[PDB]
Ligand binder design. Structure first.
Ligand SMILES: [Fe+3]
Ligand SMILES: [Fe+3]
Lengths: 252, 57, 104, 215, 181, 549, 112, 224
C-alpha cells in the first residue's frame, strides 16, 4: 500500500456506518482516525491504545484556540472537552504526558524529559509521522493541499485537514478510497531492496566502530582508520540478504 | 519502449543502475560522525570520496 | 500599446524648457546628483522634479517592455508611487526638487 | 469650460437664516473664483477638457494623489450641489422616498439627525458633510471629508450637502458652528432635492427588492 | 520593495466570472420635415424644477411614487413633448402637440416614431430535437444566449434526467469539471 | 427553508426558472417517471404524454384544435409562469434639449483652427443657464418662426464643418484599423464592409448626456441590449443575468426606444465604446445585476498588466502587506554606481601592479593611447561561468573591462606618490599604510549624494504623511497591500505551530539537521574543541585599533 | 459523471435548500433535467483578478583598498574558509586570523 | 492645566491691519475654546505637567494623531501667531537674520514674494511657516558625518489644519494664519490683501530674529 491518507467505512454490529481515515507513512506506520458512536474522534494506534485528537493535537503544541477556527465544526471538538482534558491541553507538556499515558497504558504520572520525547520520537514520530516524498505527494492530492514537495514530514495541518473531510464525508461529500486501486500502491525493485540493506549495513558498521573506538581508547593507542572498520557488516548483510530474504530467489 | 517492445530485463537493469548512482550516495550519507563519550576521538567518512572497483574474480 | 507610457503613468515632460520656467522653479539653486553607467531600482513614494543638463536616462516602469526616452534639457516630474527602473548608458548629472503635497 | 450657475433662489431668499452678505461672498467670488480658476486650467489641456464633471473630479483625484486641477473642479461641483441642497423655507421633515430610506438605514429620522450633526460637529478644519448613497451597499450613509473632496471619488451619489468651511458661515454665526448646523437642518435643508437625487441614483443603485417567482 | 532590489532598454474566448469560465466558438454557435432616422436628438439640459444636474427625463411605477414632489405632480406627461433652445436662449417647438425633433447633422426637423405613450425567447433551454418550423432544421440542446433579427446564438448544454430521490451534487451555477459526480 | 433558499439562489447565484422546451420523449420521461418504475400510468398528464409520443396523434390533435403546425411549434416557445406588471413610463417634464458640441472635440492628433475651436467651446458654458418649467411660454416660436434658418446654431455649424472635414480625412484609415485589430464583427465594433453606409455617425459625434432615438437590434443574456443609434458603433445598455427573466417581456428586438448616452470610450480598449441607458421604457427598477467594470479587450500588444489596468480604470494587482512602515525604515546610502567604480578601481590597481612588475612592455606607446584586443565586445561585459576550487564548483563571474574608461595617468601618479613615500618610509625604517585612495573618496562622495537623496526624500515623505493624515488622503496606493486572509484561507506559514514539525525536536534526517551538523564539521576543522573567549562587534574592531595606531 | 466541463443549472423540481445545512447535495421531489452549460477551462492559468473580469474578450492566452562592503554583502580579494556547498548558515566561522604575536615554538599548557 | 494669556499688545493697537472685533473673537472665542477643550481633555491624563511643545510632539504620535492633538496644536499655533505680530511690525529685518534670508532666498523681495505665494496657495484651513532646518529623524543612518552648515537653513512650509513644523523636529520662526477665521471679518476672501498687509505692517522681525537665535542655540546644544 502506497503512503498517504485512505478513507474507509465499515459497518458495526447494528449496521451503523462508521467512517475512518488512515495515515500510511513511508515505513507502513498506520495512524487510524475513527469516528465513534458519540462522534468522538480517537487517534487509534493499537488494538487497545486509544488517544483523542485534542490530546494528540495539543501534544505537538496546537493550541486549543486555533484547532476550532481551522475546522468547519468547532462545536463537535468542544463538546468532548471534559474539565480534566482542558487543563492538560492548556499547557504543551501536560498534553505530552497525557498522550504518553494513553499511548503506553502505563500506570503512574511520567516526568517530562528529553529522553522521554526521544523515546517517543523513535517509537511514534520515527515510524508514524514521516510520509516521505511519495507520502507527501498523495496527501497534497487526496486532501487537496498546496504544500511544497520538499516537506517529507506529516505537517500538523494535514491531521486537522483530514478531520475536516472525515466528518465532512459523513454527509455525502466525496467518495471512499479504493484500497485495491493500483494508484494506492507502490513497486519496490532491486533498487529499493539493495538500498535498504545498505541502510542496515552502515547502521551495523557504526556499532562495530563504536565498540572499536572505545576499545582502542581504553588502551590509549592511536588506531589507523583502516583498523577501526572491518568488512563484515556490508559483506555479511548482503551475503545473508540473498540467502534468507523471501524476495531473493534462486534463478530458474 | 515508445516504439518497440522493451527489454524484458530493462526494469532490473535500470533499477540496479539507479542504486549505483543515487542509492549509494543517499545511504553513505546519514552515517553519523562517530565521536567518543569524551569527544576526544572523532571518526567520520568522506562520502564524496566513495568508489567502486571492478571485481577481481 | 497605442497609449504612450508617459500618458499611462502620468509623467510630466517639459522638454526644451525655457529659461523663464527654470528661473521660476529655482533649478539653479538645486543639488546635483551624478551617475555613470549604472542601474537604480527606485520607487517614487514622493513627487520629484528632475532637470537633465548632461547625460541620458531611459526609464523602464516595473513590468514594462518599453521605455520613456529622456534627453538633456528636459524637465521631468516623476509621480508618486511610480515603480520604475532607472538606466544610464553614459555619465549623467541632474538637478532635483522633491515636492510634497501641494507646494508647487 | 463651465459657467457659474446661480442658485435656484434669489440671494436674499435665505434671510434671516442665511444673510445676503454670506451669499454674495460665497457665490460672488468664492464660487466664482473656483469656476474661473478651473477654466484657465482647462484652457491649456485638451485631455482634461472633454471629461464630464464627474469624470474630471475622479480623473484629477488620481487615486489619492490629486492633480493640480482637482481642487478647482471639485469645489465647483460641491458649491453647485450646496445651493440646490438648500431651499427657501426648508427644514421640517422629509417625506415619501427619503423618509423610509432614512428610517431604514439609520433606524429612524431622530437617529439620523444626531448622526448627521456629529459629523459636522467633529469635522476639524474646512470640509464638507454628506448624506450619500453607497453604491455597493445600497444604503444611505453620513460621511465627513475635508477640503474639496467629495464622495464622487468613491463612486457614491451625494444626496444632501452641507458646507462647514468657515467662509460659509463666519458672518452670521462666526465660531458658533453648532447652532449653524441645527439651523440648516431646521430651516434650509431641501428634502425636495433629496427626492430627485435619490431618483437619479435609482438609475444606478436600485434600492428596491426583486420579484422572485415561487416556482 | 523596489529599493531593496540588489531587461536593459539600451541593449480567443470571453471571460465569464461570478470562478472563471471561457466562452468561445467551442461552446457557442449560431442557429439561423425629413426622413425619420435613428440618431441623437441633442443634449438634454437641466430643468431646475427637478433639482437634478442631469435630467431624469422619466419615471417608472416605483420611482414616481417614491421620488415625485408634490409641486411636480402637474409636470408628468404621458407622451413626449420636445422643445429646443438655441445659443441665444430662444425656445423652439414647431408644434405643441406632436413629436418633432431636430437632426443635428442635417439641421432639419422631423418626426419621431411612436410618440412614446419573436418565437424564441432569451434564456430558454432547448432539447436536442426540438422543432421550430417544418422548413427549419431541428434546434440543438442549449440555452439561448444571443437574440438577433434572424438568428439566435446558443450556448450548448447537456440535460441529465433524474428520477425523484436522486441527489444533485453541487449548488446552482457550480463549476463541474469532466468526470466529476 | 424552501422559500429563502430559492431567494438566495436567485440573488447570489443567478438562478432563474427558464423555460425548458422539451421533446415529446423528454416530456413523457418527466411526466411518467413521477409515478413509478413499471406501473399503469394514471395521472392524465402522463397519459397525454404517452399519446403524444406518436406525431400522428399530435397532428390529429392540432387538426381537431383547428390550428396549423407552424405556430403550434411556435406555441411551444411561450414564456411560462406569471407576467410582470406593465410599464408606465412617465416623463419628468418636457424634453428640453440643446445642440451642444462634444467637449472632447477634436480627436487627439488632429489639428484644427484654435479660434474656431474656442468659438465652438463658448457653447459649453451654456450648461450653467437655468431653465424653469414656468418659463417656456413667453417666447415659444411655433411654426414658421421655428424654421431652421431662424435658428442660432453657428457654433454647432462650425463643429459640423470641422467634423465633416475630419470624417472625410479619416474615414478609410479607421476602417483599415478596424479590419487590422478586430478579426470578426460583433455588436459594438465598427460597422465595416458592405454593411457600412455613408452618413453613419462617428464616435466623436457623440458625447455623454445626448438623447438618442434608436432601435434594439441584439439581446445578449450576459451583456445586455444593443441599440443602433445611427452611428458606426452600436450602443450598449448593460443588462445581465436574472434581470433578463422579466426584462425580456419589455425589451425585445426591433422596438424603438429613447436612450441616453452615459459614457463614451475608446473602441480599441473597451468592447462597447457607447454605453447607454433606457429612457423610454424605464427599466431602472428591474436592473439589479451591475457591471463592476466595463469589459475590455486583451490585445496581443498587452504584455504588462499595469499598462492594461492604467489604459482602463481598473485597480492595481494586490500583494501582501509588508507590515513595515515606510518612514521607520533606515535611509539608503549605497549608490548603485559604486560597483562600477569598484570594478574600475581594481582594474586600475591591477594594471598599475602589472606595469610595476613588467615595465618594458609600455615602451614607445603612450599609456593614454592604449588599444584593446581585437575581439573586445562592449555588449558582453558580464559573462556568467563556473569554476572548481577546493573540489567545489563555486560560481564565478567575469567582469570585462576596457582601458578607455580608466584614468591611467592619475592612478600612475598616485601610485608613484605612494611608492616614493613608501621608499622614504623604508629608508627611514618605517611602514606607511594608505587610509584610502582617490577612488575610495569618489565612492564616499557618491554615497554622500545618495544618502542626501535618501534624507531629502524621507523629509518630504514625513511632510506628506503629516499633510495626508491632517487631510485624510491615503498614505499608500489604494487597491494595493490588501489585508490578511485575502490571498485564500489556505496559506502555508512555516513559523506557525500547525505547520511546525519541531514539536519533539528537529528530525535527525531533516534538511536543517543536515546543514546544522555540516557547519559544525566546517567549524571544528577551523577552531576545534576550544572555548569561546568572548565576542566583539565588527564596528568595535574598526574603532579601537584606530585609536591604538 | 460530467461528460464535459461546465456549470450546473436546474429550473424546477430541485430543492434550493441543501439536505444538510453545510453540504451542497440537493434532492429532487419530482423528475427533472439537470443541465450542464459548457465552458472553457481556466485550468492552471495564473489569472489576476484585477485585469480579467466578466465579459472580457481575451485575444491572447492566459589589501582592504580592493575590498568593499555593501548592503548585506561584502567583498574579499587572515585566511577565509568557504564551505563545500558554498552556503553559510547562521553563526558560522568563515575567516580566522592566526596572529603571530601568540605563536609559540615551545610546548606546555594554556591557562585562562 | 494650561491657561490662555492675553496678546502682548492692546486689542485696539493693530488697527487698521486687524480690527478689534476680529482680534477679540479670534482670541477669546477660538483660542480660548481650544485651550479650554485641551484642559478638559488633559484632566487626569499623563499629559499633565509637560510643556506645550512636549504636548504637541506626544499627541502627534508619529502620524496616528491622538484625539488631543487638534486642541493642543491649535493652541500652540495661536500662541505662536500672536507673538509674531506687533503694531510697529513690518519693514525689513537686519543682521544675521537678513544674511540668512539672503543666503536662502537670494534677495528679500524674492523671500517675501515666495512667502506671499505660499500663503495665498494654502488651500483650505491651515498655516504657512518659516522655520529653521534643525531636524533629526528617528532612524539610524540619519546622521551626516560631514555637515556643510548649509543643511541647517531657513525654508518655507505650508501645513493644513493644526499641523506645525515642530512635528518634523523643525524650529518655527514666523507664521501667518491662513485659516479663514483669522481675516474673514476684515478681508473676507481678499486673502492677497490680507497677506500683503500682514507682511508690510505686522511682521515683527525682532521676534523672528530672537527665534532664529534660539534655534541656533538649540542646534548648538544638540551639537555636543
Ligand atoms: Fe464653499
Ligand atoms: Fe487661527
Amino acid at each position: 500500500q502506497s503512503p498517504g491518507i485512505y478513507y474507509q467505512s465499515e459497518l458495526d454490529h447494528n449496521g451503523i456506518s462508521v467512517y475512518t481515515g488512515t495515515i500510511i507513512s513511508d515505513w507502513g506506520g498506520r495512524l487510524e482516525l475513527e469516528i465513534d458512536k458519540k462522534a468522538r474522534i480517537w487517534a487509534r494506534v493499537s488494538r487497545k491504545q486509544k488517544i483523542s485528537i485534542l490530546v494528540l493535537s495539543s501534544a505537538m503544541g496546537s493550541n486549543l484556540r486555533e484547532i476550532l477556527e481551522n475546522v468547519c465544526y468547532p462545536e463537535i471538538f468542544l463538546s468532548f472537552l471534559t474539565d480534566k482534558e482542558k487543563k492538560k491541553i492548556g499547557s504543551k507538556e501536560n498534553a505530552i504526558l497525557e498522550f504518553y499515558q494513553q499511548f503506553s497504558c502505563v500506570g503512574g504520572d511520567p516526568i517530562f524529559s528529553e529522553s522521554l520525547c526521544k523515546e517517543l520520537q523513535k517509537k511514534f514520530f520515527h515510524q508514524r509521522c514521516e510520509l516521505g516524498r511519495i507520502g507527501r505527494r498523495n496527501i497534497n492530492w487526496r486532501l487537496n493541499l498546496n504544500i511544497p514537495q520538499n516537506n517529507i514530514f506529516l505537517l500538523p495541518r494535514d491531521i486537522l485537514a483530514a478531520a475536516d473531510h472525515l466528518i465532512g464525508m459523513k454527509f455525502g461529500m466525496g467518495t471512499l478510497d479504493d484500497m485495491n486501486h493500483l494508484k494506492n500502491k507502490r513497486i519496490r525493485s532491486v533498487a529499493d531492496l539493495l538500498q535498504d540493506q545498505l541502510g542496515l549495513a552502515l547502521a551495523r558498521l557504526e556499532n562495530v566502530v563504536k565498540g572499536t573506538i572505545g576499545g582502542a581508547i581504553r588502551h590509549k593507542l592511536i588506531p589507523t582508520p583502516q583498523n577501526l572498520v572491518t568488512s563484515t557488516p556490508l559483506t555479511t548483510t548482503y551475503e545473508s540478504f540473498f540467502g534468507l530474504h523471501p524476495l531473493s530467489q534462486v534463478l530458474d | 519502449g515508445t516504439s518497440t517492445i522493451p527489454g524484458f530485463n530493462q526494469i532490473q537493469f535500470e533499477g540496479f543502475y539507479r542504486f549505483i548512482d543515487q542509492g549509494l550516495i543517499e545511504e553513505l550519507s546519514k552515517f553519523p560522525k562517530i565521536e567518543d563519550i569524551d569527544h576526544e576521538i572523532e571518526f567520520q567518512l568522506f562520502v564524496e570520496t566513495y568508489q567502486l572497483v571492478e571485481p577481481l574474480i | 500599446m497605442q497609449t504612450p507610457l508617459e500618458e499611462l503613468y502620468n509623467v510630466k515632460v517639459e522638454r526644451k524648457v525655457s529659461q523663464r520656467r527654470l528661473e521660476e522653479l529655482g533649478v539653479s539653486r538645486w543639488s546635483v546628483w551624478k551617475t555613470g553607467k549604472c542601474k537604480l531600482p527606485w520607487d517614487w513614494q514622493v513627487d520629484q522634479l528632475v532637470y537633465i543638463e548632461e547625460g541620458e536616462v531611459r526609464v523602464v516602469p516595473e513590468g514594462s517592455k518599453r521605455f520613456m526616452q529622456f534627453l538633456a534639457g528636459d524637465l521631468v516630474r516623476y509621480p508618486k508611487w511610480l515603480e520604475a527602473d532607472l538606466f544610464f548608458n553614459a555619465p549623467y548629472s541632474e538637478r532635483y526638487c522633491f515636492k510634497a503635497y501641494a507646494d508647487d | 469650460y463651465y459657467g457659474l450657475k446661480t442658485p435656484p433662489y434669489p440671494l436674499d431668499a435665505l434671510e434671516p437664516y442665511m444673510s445676503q452678505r454670506t451669499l454674495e461672498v460665497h457665490w460672488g467670488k468664492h464660487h466664482r473664483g473656483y469656476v474661473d480658476n478651473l477654466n484657465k486650467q482647462l484652457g491649456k489641456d485638451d485631455r482634461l477638457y472633454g471629461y464630464t464633471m464627474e469624470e474630471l473630479i475622479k480623473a484629477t483625484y488620481n487615486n489619492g494623489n490629486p492633480l493640480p486641477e482637482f481642487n478647482n473642479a471639485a469645489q465647483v461641483y460641491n458649491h453647485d450641489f450646496f445651493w440646490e441642497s438648500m431651499q427657501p423655507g426648508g427644514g421640517d421633515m422629509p417625506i415619501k422616498g427619503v423618509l423610509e430610506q432614512i428610517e431604514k438605514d439609520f433606524g429612524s429620522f431622530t437617529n439620523f439627525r444626531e448622526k448627521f450633526t456629529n459629523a459636522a460637529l467633529t469635522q476639524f478644519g474646512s470640509g464638507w458633510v454628506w448624506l450619500v448613497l453607497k453604491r455597493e451597499e445600497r444604503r444611505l450613509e453620513v460621511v465627513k471629508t475635508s477640503n474639496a473632496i467629495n464622495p464622487l471619488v468613491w463612486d457614491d451619489i451625494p444626496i444632501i450637502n452641507l458646507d462647514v468651511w468657515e467662509h460659509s458661515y463666519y458672518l452670521d454665526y462666526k465660531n458658533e458652528r453648532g447652532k449653524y448646523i441645527n439651523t440648516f437642518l431646521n430651516h434650509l435643508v431641501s428634502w425636495n432635492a433629496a427626492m430627485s437625487r435619490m431618483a437619479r441614483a435609482e438609475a444606478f443603485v436600485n434600492l428596491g427588492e426583486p420579484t422572485i417567482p415561487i416556482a | 520593495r523596489k529599493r531593496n532590489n540588489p531587461m536593459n532598454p539600451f541593449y480567443h474566448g470571453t471571460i465569464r466570472m461570478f470562478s472563471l469560465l471561457i466562452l468561445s466558438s467551442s461552446n457557442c454557435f449560431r442557429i439561423g420635415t425629413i426622413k425619420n432616422s435613428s440618431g441623437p436628438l441633442g443634449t438634454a439640459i437641466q430643468i431646475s424644477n427637478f433639482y437634478s444636474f442631469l435630467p431624469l427625463l422619466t419615471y417608472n411605477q416605483i420611482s414616481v411614487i417614491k421620488y415625485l414632489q408634490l409641486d411636480n405632480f402637474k409636470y408628468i406627461f404621458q407622451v413626449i413633448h420636445s422643445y429646443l433652445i438655441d445659443e441665444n436662449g430662444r425656445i423652439f417647438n414647431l408644434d405643441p402637440y406632436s413629436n418633432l425633433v431636430l437632426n443635428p447633422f442635417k439641421l432639419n426637423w422631423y418626426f419621431l416614431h411612436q410618440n412614446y405613450n419573436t418565437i424564441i425567447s432569451l434564456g430558454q433551454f432547448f432539447c436536442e430535437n426540438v422543432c421550430i418550423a417544418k422548413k427549419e432544421p431541428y434546434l440543438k440542446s442549449g440555452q439561448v444566449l444571443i437574440v438577433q433579427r434572424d438568428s439566435v446564438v446558443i450556448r450548448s448544454a447537456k440535460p441529465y434526467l433524474a428520477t425523484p430521490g436522486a441527489k444533485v451534487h453541487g449548488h446552482y451555477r457550480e463549476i463541474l469539471y469532466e468526470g466529476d459526480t | 427553508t424552501e422559500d429563502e433558499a430559492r431567494r438566495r439562489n436567485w440573488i447570489e447565484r443567478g438562478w432563474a426558472p427558464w423555460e425548458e422546451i422539451l421533446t415529446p420523449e423528454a416530456d413523457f420521461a418527466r411526466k411518467s417517471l413521477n409515478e413509478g418504475e413499471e406501473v399503469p400510468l394514471q395521472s392524465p398528464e402522463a397519459i397525454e404524454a404517452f399519446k403524444m409520443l406518436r406525431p400522428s396523434y399530435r397532428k390529429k390533435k392540432i387538426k381537431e384544435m383547428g390550428i396549423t403546425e407552424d405556430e403550434w411549434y411556435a406555441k411551444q416557445f411561450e414564456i411560462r409562469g406569471d407576467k410582470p406588471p406593465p410599464l408606465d413610463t412617465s416623463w419628468a417634464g418636457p424634453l428640453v434639449v440643446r445642440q451642444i458640441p462634444p467637449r472632447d472635440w477634436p480627436p487627439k492628433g488632429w489639428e484644427v483652427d484654435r479660434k474656431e475651436l474656442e468659438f465652438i467651446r463658448e457653447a459649453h458654458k451654456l450648461m450653467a443657464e437655468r431653465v424653469w418649467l414656468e418659463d417656456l411660454d413667453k417666447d415659444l416660436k411655433v411654426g414658421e418662426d421655428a424654421t431652421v434658418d431662424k435658428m442660432c446654431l453657428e457654433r454647432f455649424k462650425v463643429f459640423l464643418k470641422q467634423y465633416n472635414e475630419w470624417v472625410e480625412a479619416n474615414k478609410d484609415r479607421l476602417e483599415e484599423d478596424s479590419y487590422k485589430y478586430d478579426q470578426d464583427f460583433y455588436p459594438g465594433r465598427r460597422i465595416r464592409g458592405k454593411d457600412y453606409k455613408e452618413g453613419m455617425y462617428e464616435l466623436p459625434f457623440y458625447y455623454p448626456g445626448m438623447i438618442c432615438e434608436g432601435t434594439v437590434t441584439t439581446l445578449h443574456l450576459y451583456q445586455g441590449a444593443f441599440v443602433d443609434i445611427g452611428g458606426v458603433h452600436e450602443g450598449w445598455v448593460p443588462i445581465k443575468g436574472n434581470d433578463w427573466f422579466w426584462i425580456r417581456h419589455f425589451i425585445r428586438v426591433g422596438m424603438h426606444v429613447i436612450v441616453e448616452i452615459t459614457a463614451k470610450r475608446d473602441p480599441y480598449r473597451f468592447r462597447f465604446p457607447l454605453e447607454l441607458r433606457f429612457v423610454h421604457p424605464n427599466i431602472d427598477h428591474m436592473i439589479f445585476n451591475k457591471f463592476d467594470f466595463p469589459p475590455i479587450f486583451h490585445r496581443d500588444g498587452d504584455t504588462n498588466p499595469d499598462e492594461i489596468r492604467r489604459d482602463c480604470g481598473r485597480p492595481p494587482e494586490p500583494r501582501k502587506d509588508p507590515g513595515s512602515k515606510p518612514e521607520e525604515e533606515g535611509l539608503l546610502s549605497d549608490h548603485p554606481y559604486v560597483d562600477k567604480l569598484w570594478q574600475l578601481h581594481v582594474a586600475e590597481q591591477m594594471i598599475l601592479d602589472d606595469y610595476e612588475a613588467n615595465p618594458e612592455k609600455y615602451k614607445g606607446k603612450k599609456l593614454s593611447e592604449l588599444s584593446d584586443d581585437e575581439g573586445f565586445d562592449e555588449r558582453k561585459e558580464i559573462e556568467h561561468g563556473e569554476a572548481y576550487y577546493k573540489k567545489t564548483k563555486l560560481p564565478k563571474v567575469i567582469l570585462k573591462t576596457s582601458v578607455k574608461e580608466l584614468d591611467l595617468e592619475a592612478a600612475l601618479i598616485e601610485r608613484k606618490y605612494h611608492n616614493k613615500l613608501m621608499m622614504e618610509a623604508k629608508a627611514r625604517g618605517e611602514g606607511y599604510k594608505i587610509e584610502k585612495l582617490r577612488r575610495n573618496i569618489e565612492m564616499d562622495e557618491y554615497d554622500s549624494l545618495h544618502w542626501r537623496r535618501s534624507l531629502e526624500e524621507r523629509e518630504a515623505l514625513l511632510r506628506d504623511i503629516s499633510s495626508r493624515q491632517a487631510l485624510g488622503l491615503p498614505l499608500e496606493e489604494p487597491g494595493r497591500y490588501k489585508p490578511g486572509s485575502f490571498f485564500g484561507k489556505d496559506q502555508y506559514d512555516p513559523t506557525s505551530a500547525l505547520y511546525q514539525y519541531d514539536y519533539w525536536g528537529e528530525p535527525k534526517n531533516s534538511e536543517i539537521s543536515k546543514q546544522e551538523r555540516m557547519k559544525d564539521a566546517h567549524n571544528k576543522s577551523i577552531v576545534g574543541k576550544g572555548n569561546v573567549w568572548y565576542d566583539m562587534s565588527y564596528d568595535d574592531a574598526i574603532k579601537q585599533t584606530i585609536e591604538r595606531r | 459523471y460530467s461528460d464535459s466541463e461546465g456549470e450546473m443549472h436546474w429550473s424546477t423540481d430541485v430543492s434550493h435548500a441543501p439536505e444538510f445545512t453545510y453540504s451542497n447535495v440537493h434532492l429532487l421531489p419530482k423528475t427533472s433535467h439537470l443541465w450542464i452549460l459548457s465552458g472553457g477551462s481556466c485550468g492552471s492559468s495564473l489569472i489576476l483578478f484585477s485585469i480579467h473580469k466578466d465579459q472580457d474578450q481575451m485575444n491572447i492566452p492566459f589589501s582592504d583598498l580592493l575590498a568593499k562592503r555593501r548592503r548585506n554583502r561584502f567583498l574579499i580579494p587572515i585566511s577565509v574558509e568557504i564551505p563545500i556547498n558554498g552556503i553559510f548558515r547562521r553563526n558560522s566561522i568563515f575567516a580566522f586570523f592566526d596572529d603571530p604575536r601568540y605563536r609559540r615554538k615551545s610546548s606546555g599548557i594554556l591557562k585562562y | 492645566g494650561f491657561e490662555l494669556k492675553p496678546p502682548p499688545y492692546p486689542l485696539d493697537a493693530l488697527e487698521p491691519h486687524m480690527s478689534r472685533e476680529t482680534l477679540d473673537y479670534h482670541w477669546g472665542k477660538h483660542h480660548k475654546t481650544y485651550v479650554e477643550n485641551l484642559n478638559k481633555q488633559i484632566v487626569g491624563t499623563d499629559l499633565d505637567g509637560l510643556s506645550l511643545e512636549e504636548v504637541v510632539l506626544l499627541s502627534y504620535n508619529r502620524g496616528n494623531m491622538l484625539p488631543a492633538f487638534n486642541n493642543a496644536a491649535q493652541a500652540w499655533n495661536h500662541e505662536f501667531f500672536w507673538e509674531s505680530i506687533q503694531p510697529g511690525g513690518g519693514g525689513k529685518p537686519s543682521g544675521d537674520l537678513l544674511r540668512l534670508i539672503e543666503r536662502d532666498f537670494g534677495s528679500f523681495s524674492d523671500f517675501v514674494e515666495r512667502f506671499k505665494a505660499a500663503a495665498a496657495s494654502n488651500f483650505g484651513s491651515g498655516w504657512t511657516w518659516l522655520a529653521y532646518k534643525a531636524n533629526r529623524l528617528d532612524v539610524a543612518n540619519a546622521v551626516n558625518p560631514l555637515p556643510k552648515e548649509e543643511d541647517k537653513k531657513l525654508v518655507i512650509v505650508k501645513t493644513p489644519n493644526a499641523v506645525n513644523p515642530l512635528v518634523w523636529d523643525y524650529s518655527p520662526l514666523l507664521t501667518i494664519d491662513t485659516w479663514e477665521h483669522a481675516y474673514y471679518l476684515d478681508f473676507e476672501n481678499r486673502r492677497i490683501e490680507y497677506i500683503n498687509t500682514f507682511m508690510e505692517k505686522l511682521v515683527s522681525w525682532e521676534t523672528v530674529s530672537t527665534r532664529l537665535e534660539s534655534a541656533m542655540a538649540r542646534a548648538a546644544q544638540r551639537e555636543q
